[PDB]
């Protein structure tokens, strides 16, 4: 994924999720995209209530993009692979 200063444009399915999280922009840095994804998971309460580094996304639009039913915030590979598929580098 691109560096800190590099700007990206999220593909429609991802942009839609960032919009739910309150994103107004169309062009982001990777860190900004990550901020809104965290907001989204928090708002929809997709994290496991007891072990909160686990996210359950199996029946959510985010799970469709990630292509997994759950992931660990400490094993973020699925997230970065999703971003590679869904971010246009500007």
């Amino acid at each position: 994924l691109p560096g800190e200063g590099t700007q990206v444009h999220p593909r429609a399915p991802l942009l839609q999720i960032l919009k739910v999280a309150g994103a107004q922009e169309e062009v982001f840095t990777v860190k900004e995209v990550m901020h809104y994804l965290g907001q989204y998971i928090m708002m929809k309460q997709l994290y496991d209530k007891q072990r909160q580094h686990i996210v359950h996304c199996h029946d959510d639009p985010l799970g469709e993009l990630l292509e997994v039913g759950s992931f660990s915030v400490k094993n973020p590979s699925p997230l970065y692979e999703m971003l590679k598929r869904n971010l246009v580098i500007l």
Partner: peptide, 14 residues
């Protein structure tokens, strides 16, 4: 930790 705290760590890394 809380999810907020875990994600904040992840955000700071990326």
């Amino acid at each position: 930790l809380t999810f907020x705290e875990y994600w904040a760590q992840x955000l700071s890394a990326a």
